[PDB]
Amino acid sequence: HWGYGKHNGPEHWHKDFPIAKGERQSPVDIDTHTAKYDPSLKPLSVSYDQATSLRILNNGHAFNVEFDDSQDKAVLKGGPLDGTYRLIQFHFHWGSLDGQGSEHTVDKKKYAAELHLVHWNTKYGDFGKAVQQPDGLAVLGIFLKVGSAKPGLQKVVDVLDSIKTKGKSADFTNFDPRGLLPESLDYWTYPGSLTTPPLLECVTWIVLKEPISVSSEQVLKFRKLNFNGEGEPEELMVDNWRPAQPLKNRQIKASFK
Numbered sequence: 001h002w003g004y005g006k007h008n009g010p011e012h013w014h015k016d017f018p019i020a021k022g023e024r025q026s027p028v029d030i031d032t033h034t035a036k037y038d039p040s041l042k043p044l045s046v047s048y049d050q051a052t053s054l055r056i057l058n059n060g061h062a063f064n065v066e067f068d069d070s071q072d073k074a075v076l077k078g079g080p081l082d083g084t085y086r087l088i089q090f091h092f093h094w095g096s097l098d099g100q101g102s103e104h105t106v107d108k109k110k111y112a113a114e115l116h117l118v119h120w121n122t123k124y125g126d127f128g129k130a131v132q133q134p135d136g137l138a139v140l141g142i143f144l145k146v147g148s149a150k151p152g153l154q155k156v157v158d159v160l161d162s163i164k165t166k167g168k169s170a171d172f173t174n175f176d177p178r179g180l181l182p183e184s185l186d187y188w189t190y191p192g193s194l195t196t197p198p199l200l201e202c203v204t205w206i207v208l209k210e211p212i213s214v215s216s217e218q219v220l221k222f223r224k225l226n227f228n229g230e231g232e233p234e235e236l237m238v239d240n241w242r243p244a245q246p247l248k249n250r251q252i253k254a255s256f257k
């Protein structure tokens with residue numbers, strides 16, 4: 001029953017998931033002026049050439065594009081990470097209006113949407129074990145602004161009408177996630193959490209400084225999805241973002257400047 005409505009949205013989550021008020025919750029506002037440059041941070045290594053997408057799923061909260069993570073085919077390493085993390089899925093958060101939708105903010109600015117490419121640390125052998133560990137996940141976050149279309153997004157947008165409602169899925173092979181990346185891999189990083197229940201404090205966040213542009217029509221199509229199942233009243237899947245959480249005792253590190 002958690003979700004993003006008036007009665008079960010983010011401000012309610014702590015009653016089922018008390019870690020919602022924990023010490024390393026996400027997202028957060030990224031104060032660009034107070035981010036610490038760390039000249040010992042390494043370039044991020046994104047190795048997506050052998051990625052294998054499988055399926056796209058409407059889970060009732062967002063849509064996931066899922067990958068075969070049974071081998072080291074699409075991996076993230078380097079950057080602030082020790083060892084190697086396997087891509088398991090990506091998804092987005094977005095708004096009802098172009099002026100909101102991102103989970104992280106930059107100097108309090110909201111983007112129209114945010115892409116999360118979720119990876120798990122191979123030393124834990126699977127995603128369900130990894131989320132129980134403080135260094136189990138590496139989530140690469142990329143902001144979306146509305147402007148020119150992103151052509152490598154259009155395969156995703158065009159399949160959405162087949163997964164409109166909660167529970168629907170569709171085969172989704174040969175999707176190349178390199179088409180969703182901006183030119184620069186400059187990033188911020190900080191230790192945080194999943195941004196939806198169960199809110200587990202298992203994530204190394206890596207947030208790219210450069211947003212990708214998508215067109216207004218591409219984001220409009222995300223807003224035609226539904227939170228409800230087929231044959232239930234229509235509740236459009238919009239504003240599926242958690243607001244910024246207290247930074248507490250954390251420092252955001254920058255790979256640049």
Ligand SMILES: Cc1cc(=O)[nH]c(SCC(=O)c2cccc(S(N)(=O)=O)c2)n1
Pocket residue numbers: 088089116118127139193194195196197198
């Ligand atoms: C329950 C389940 C089964 C599975 O096979 N795969 C997954 S992937 C879960 C996931 O990627 C995710 C789960 C919750 C939150 C976030 S976020 N917004 O990037 O912090 C990501 N979940």
Ligand SMILES: [Zn+2]
Pocket residue numbers: 091092093116195
């Ligand atoms: Zn997410």
